[PDB]
Each structure stands twice: as structure tokens, then as C-alpha cells.
Design a protein around this motif. Sequence first.
Motif, short mmCIF file in Angstrom:
data_model
loop_
_atom_site.label_atom_id
_atom_site.label_comp_id
_atom_site.label_asym_id
_atom_site.label_seq_id
_atom_site.Cartn_x
_atom_site.Cartn_y
_atom_site.Cartn_z
N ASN A 1 -45.82 16.93 46.43
CA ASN A 1 -45.70 15.68 47.19
C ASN A 1 -47.07 15.04 47.37
O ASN A 1 -47.15 13.82 47.24
N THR A 2 -48.13 15.84 47.66
CA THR A 2 -49.51 15.31 47.76
C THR A 2 -49.89 14.61 46.46
O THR A 2 -50.42 13.50 46.48
N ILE A 3 -49.62 15.26 45.34
CA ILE A 3 -49.92 14.71 44.01
C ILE A 3 -49.16 13.40 43.76
O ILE A 3 -49.77 12.40 43.33
N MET A 4 -47.83 13.41 44.03
CA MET A 4 -46.96 12.24 43.84
C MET A 4 -47.38 11.05 44.72
O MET A 4 -47.39 9.91 44.26
N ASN B 1 -44.19 25.14 50.65
CA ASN B 1 -45.62 24.81 50.45
C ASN B 1 -45.88 24.22 49.08
O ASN B 1 -46.66 23.26 48.95
N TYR B 2 -45.28 24.82 48.03
CA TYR B 2 -45.42 24.26 46.67
C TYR B 2 -44.95 22.80 46.68
O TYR B 2 -45.69 21.91 46.21
N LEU C 1 -54.08 21.90 46.16
CA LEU C 1 -54.41 23.32 45.82
C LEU C 1 -54.40 24.21 47.06
O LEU C 1 -54.10 25.39 46.93
N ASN C 2 -54.74 23.66 48.25
CA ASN C 2 -54.59 24.42 49.50
C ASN C 2 -53.10 24.77 49.68
O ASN C 2 -52.78 25.91 49.98
N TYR C 3 -52.20 23.81 49.42
CA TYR C 3 -50.75 24.09 49.49
C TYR C 3 -50.32 25.10 48.44
O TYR C 3 -49.50 25.98 48.73
N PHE C 4 -50.85 24.97 47.21
CA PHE C 4 -50.45 25.92 46.15
C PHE C 4 -50.93 27.31 46.49
O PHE C 4 -50.20 28.27 46.27
N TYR D 1 -48.60 27.60 39.41
CA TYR D 1 -49.79 27.66 38.56
C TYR D 1 -49.81 26.52 37.56
O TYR D 1 -50.88 25.98 37.30
N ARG D 2 -48.66 26.16 36.97
CA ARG D 2 -48.60 25.03 36.04
C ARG D 2 -49.11 23.72 36.69
O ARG D 2 -50.03 23.09 36.14
N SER D 3 -48.62 23.39 37.92
CA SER D 3 -49.05 22.18 38.63
C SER D 3 -50.53 22.30 39.01
O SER D 3 -51.26 21.32 38.92
N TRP D 4 -50.97 23.49 39.43
CA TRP D 4 -52.36 23.82 39.77
C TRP D 4 -53.28 23.54 38.54
O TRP D 4 -54.32 22.87 38.66
#
Lengths: 237, 237, 184, 53, 53
Positions: free
Chosen positions: B58-61, B52-53, B111-114, B143-146
Motif C-alpha cells: 500500500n505504501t508503494i501504491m 504488514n506486507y 521495507l520497515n513493513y516488509f 522478498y519479491r516486492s522488497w
Amino acid sequence: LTEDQKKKKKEIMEQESLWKNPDFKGYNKTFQELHQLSKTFANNQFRLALSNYQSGVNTIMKNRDWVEQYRKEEAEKKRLDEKWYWQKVDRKAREERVVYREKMKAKQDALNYFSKAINHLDEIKNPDLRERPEFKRLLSDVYRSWIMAEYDLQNLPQTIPILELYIEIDDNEKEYPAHKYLASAYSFEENMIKKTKGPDDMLFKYRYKKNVHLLRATELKYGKDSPEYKHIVNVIN
Amino acid sequence: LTEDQKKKKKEIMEQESLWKNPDFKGYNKTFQELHQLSKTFANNQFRLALSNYQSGVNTIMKNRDWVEQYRKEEAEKKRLDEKWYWQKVDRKAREERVVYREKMKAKQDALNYFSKAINHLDEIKNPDLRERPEFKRLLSDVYRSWIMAEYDLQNLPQTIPILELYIEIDDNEKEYPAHKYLASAYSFEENMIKKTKGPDDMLFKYRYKKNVHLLRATELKYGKDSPEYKHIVNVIN
Amino acid sequence: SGKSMADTEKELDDNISEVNKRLRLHTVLFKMLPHKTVLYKGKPSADGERCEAADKQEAQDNTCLHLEVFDFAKFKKMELFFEGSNNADPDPRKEQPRNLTKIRTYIYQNNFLLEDKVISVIADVAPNGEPAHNDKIELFYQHVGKYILSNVENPIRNNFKKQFYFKNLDYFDKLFTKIFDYND
Amino acid sequence: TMTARSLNLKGQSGELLSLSTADKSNDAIGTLDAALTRISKQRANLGAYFNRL
Amino acid sequence: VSQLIDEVDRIASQAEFNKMNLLQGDFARGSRATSMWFHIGPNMHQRERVFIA
């Protein structure tokens, strides 16, 4: 000079600094020393009292910045309908009005904050805590800024009950500016009675209190039986 | 530079790299290490949390790729009705909205994935497993990516509980960017109270927390016994 | 894995050691403030875990430094207890370090949570010995019960030193250094 | 609602027999815009509620 | 003439309708790019655009 005269000279300069119109270094110093005390006190109501006091002075400091910015923006306007004397006379008068009205609101907001600081200090009921040097210094500084906020806007009668409460706290009575402001505010009230043709009892009350604090300010700065003390006593007697 | 200064300089550069905006080399390094850690961990809920993370990152990229492609396609359009300055400004503002709204949706999906990665880590109840570097390494990466996903879109108040949970987790605390972001987000919240004329308790709560993490960030990157630490604390009081 | 835990714990043992080696230098303050900081000179007293401020702050026989750290209440306290007497010379620029016998710290506010509990008191009884001195660090826990850092599972033990104890060692050693530099 | 629904400004610049005055005229009228907005829209809620009933 | 010039700048600044400023340079953008879009028919794509400053 004597050891007491040298000491006195030093103290009067420190007292004049204490009552200095606020600025950024004095703001820092004033809050830094008030910050020292609340730390040791470790009392949530005193912490709240200081939080409100500092918010009050912040209103004042933000206003001082506003006043410069406003005057700056006006100075930077090209004024085409200002070619005759009376036209410049108006726009000067309106500048004074807008600045005065905004300073009046800033004073009202600052005094609401100071009133809240006092209302929180009122909640410290334990007499062993109310007698703390921490308690007395903050209560003094809240009153001092309150006095100054009113003084700057010429609200001198309003400064009297606060100056009187101020001098009752932890040797504040030995401060030359405190007696100078009391004497000046009492003088104003005496003049109000003379201009409005008010009662003689109030004329003499205000005149008496002016002379007491005039003489006491003189005694404190120059010393008992100094040429200056002797002079004021001889005028009064 | 001394053994302590060399260590510190090296660590700050590694920490700044750790909080580097995502790119393909960092993505590759991160997921190669996380998958090796997953194989060591041998825990199905950790495997799911990582899946999931990775989907969130991947969504961000994919979004970063979309933003470049979109801006490219817009740049290559002929604008026949763009005769006036106000027309150019309007169209620019409309472009910025489309990019911001799509980045906002990508953040919401990421954030739904995180959140799902965290919900799966929550299902590892055995205290011997929750104390594994593999477990809290992933949770730290989530949390860092979040934090960064929210930070980029100026959602600074939202970063505070996640930054606070982050520094409490598995030795993260000595990371200068973590304290820099906390200080900046607290500064924002202080400014919000000042602009919205909010309560004094929240003003000084936020101002204090800004100063604590400002001072700690200063300690970490510029060093103990630096003119920099000396100055900041003397201002903070 | 356990490899990362072992390396990290080692880095933290050395971090607390290097700062303790700096803290042992604050003997230079006995023959001698930054804001929010109050320093007292004194002697180890009572049960040996607390520092009693001197009537004579400048006295040559003080062997403990007591530093109170404030912000917005008292937030932190440290007591540095030194082994050995001070040099006879009254000039602090000439004074040498003394290995610490103990470091005692207190957290009152800005309380850190280790697995949701607050360690309000930390007592290090071998600050200048082998960096790996977890069995010499007593932890007083609030939700104050006594735990030994070496009996803390490990991340937990690591979080303790990086989140609580290194912080206080480095925060205090700097505040002592400020006072020294300002008066030196 | 009560008078403390809006910035309840009292008195006016100059000499009074009270101890209160209004604030910066610019905000004072703006406040009455707030007063009008706050109450009228609250009526809107009741209006809308009536339609629901 | 001087005041007539100043009056123009003030008209442009203070010429409001329903708290919208209709003459100063908030067209075709102010803090927001929103402008005078009117919805003329009952369905979507039945729209008009007005700008002025």
C-alpha cells in the motif's frame, strides 16, 4: 618438405601467435586456456595467482582502449595555433608524451599485479604441485605478458631475467620468439656498453649471449645445418 | 513449438507477469489470493505478517499515485523566471530530486513493513507449518516486492542477499527475472570494484556470480540447445 | 496447501523425467568441447556408482559418459550409465538412445542448500522409469549421510529437485549436446 | 599515518639512479591534494576531540 | 589570436577556487544542480544566488 620441416613450420606460426600483441580475441583465448588449467588444479593460491594475472592484463587492455580514445579526442580537436610546422611538431611530441606516461603507469600497475600473481605462486610449496602442467603454463604466461609489457616501452634490459626464467620452464627453451627477444635485448645491452664506453667484460658477455640466442633462434626456426644455421655459425666462428 | 517449448514459453510469460511493476489489477489479484491462503492457513502470526506486507505494498501504491499527482501539479505551474536553458535544466533537476527523495522514504517505510512481515513469519517455529506453501508463498511475495522496491531506486548491491534468499525459498529458483536481477546486481558490483580500484578477489567473485546467473537466466528463457546458451558460455570462459 | 505441493512435485517429477529422456540420447557420443567442459568416455565400474574413463575413449564398448564441469576448481560432475550396448555402426549420426540405468552427479562448488545442508552427491537409480521416482534418488548430505528423496518432507522434496537435481540434469544434458553438435 | 597515507609517489620521469618514477603528473598533484586533505582533517579530529575534552 | 582563443577555453576550464570550477559550464548545473548559494545572515532565508559561465 620433410615431416619435421612441415611440423616445424606449423609450430613456429603457433609460437608467433602465442607472442601476439594482446587484443580481445587473444585475451579471450589466453584467459580461456589459463581458465581451463586453474580449474583442474583446484588450489586457492593458484586461483589467486590467476585472479591477479588477469587483473594485470585487464589493466593493459583498458589502457589500449584509453590510447585509441585519447588519440581520437585529440584528432577531433580543431587546432587554431598550429599553422606553422613546429606547432604541429610540438603537439605530436606531447601526444607521444601523454600516451607514453599513461602507458608507463599502466605497465607499472600491470607489473604490480603480475608480481602479486608470482607471490601467490611462490606460496605453492609442495614440489608435486609446482611440477604440474597447470602451474608451469600460468607462470610462463605471467612472465610472457611481463616481458611484453616492458618490451613495448623499450625497457629491454628489464626483460632479460624474466625471459631467462621463462625459457627454464617446460620446454619454453624451444620457442623461437623467446630466443629472438633475448637476442634483441642482449644486443641493446651490448650497444649500451659501446655507447656509454662501459667495461669490456660486459661488452663481451652481452655480445656472447646475443650470439648464443641469435644462433638458437635460427636453429629452432630453420633447422640445424640449414643454409641459415650454417651462415650464423660461420659469422660467429 | 514442442511440449517442452510451449511449457517454457508459457512459464516465462507467467514469470515476467509475476515480476511486473505493481498496478491495481495485480494488487487486487495478489491480495485476494493471499487472504484466501490466510483463511486456509489459520495462523495468527501469518495473518499479522500478511497485514504488514499489505501495508508495505500500500505504501508503494500510494507513492506511485503521489508521483503522478506531483509531476501533474508541477507541469501546470507558470514559470515566469525561466528565460534561459540553464534555468529549465536546474528546475527539472530540482523536480527529479523531490520525486526521488519521496520515493526513497516510501521505499524505507515499505521495507520497515516488509521487515515486520518477515519478523512475524520468523515466529512460526513449527517445522510442519514453515513448510506450508501459504507460509513461503507470502515470504516469496514479501522478498519479491522488497527486491523490486530497491531495484527501482538502483540499490542493486542491497538486492543480492534478498534475491539469494528468494531463489532458495519454495521453488522460486526457475524464475528467469530472479536470475536476470541477480546477474544485473552482480554486474553493478563488478563495475563498482573496477571503478573504485577495489580488491581482485571481489572483482572476480562478482564477475563469476554475474556469469552463473546470466547463464542460468539464458537457460530458462531462451532454452537448452539454443544458439543463445551455446554463445554465452563460450564468451563466459 | 497440500494441493499446490502435489501439483508442483508432479511438475518437477516430469521435468526431471523429460531431461532424463534427453540424457539417454547421449550414446551418440560413444562413436564420436564447449568451454569449461571435459568429456570422458568409459564404463560403469567399482561399486556400480562411478564411471571409469576408458584408455580408448573412442571404444565401441563404452557404456558410460563421464562429464566434468568447471568454473571459478571442479564445480560439477555427472556420470551417465546406459543400459545396453552401442550400435555396431561407427557413424554417431545414426546412433539411438539407451535408457539410463543410473545418473550420478556430484556438486563440489556452487553448493546448494536444502534446509541449510548441502547435498553434494545425488544418485538416481531409475532415471528413465516412472517420473515419480523419488525413492530411487539417494541424497548425500553435508554439514555425507544417505537420505532417500521419497522420505524428505514436502517444501523440501520440491526444493531438492528444482534447486539441485533438475539443474544438474539440464546443465549436463546441454553440455553433452554441445559436444555432440560440435563434432557431429 | 606513515608515508603510505597517500599515493606515495617516488622518483621522476627521466634518468635516475633509483628504479622508481612518479605517476601521471595530473594525479601526482591530485595525490598531494589527497595527502593534504587526509592529514589536515585528521588534525581536525584531534582538534575537535580537544574541544570535547 | 588562435592561442588567445584556446587560452580562454582553458581559463574557463581551469579557473578554480577551493577546488570549485568557477567558469566552465557547470553553472547552473554540473553533475549536481548545486550552485553558488551563500549564507549571508545567521538565520535561514538570509540567502543569495550567483551563477556564471
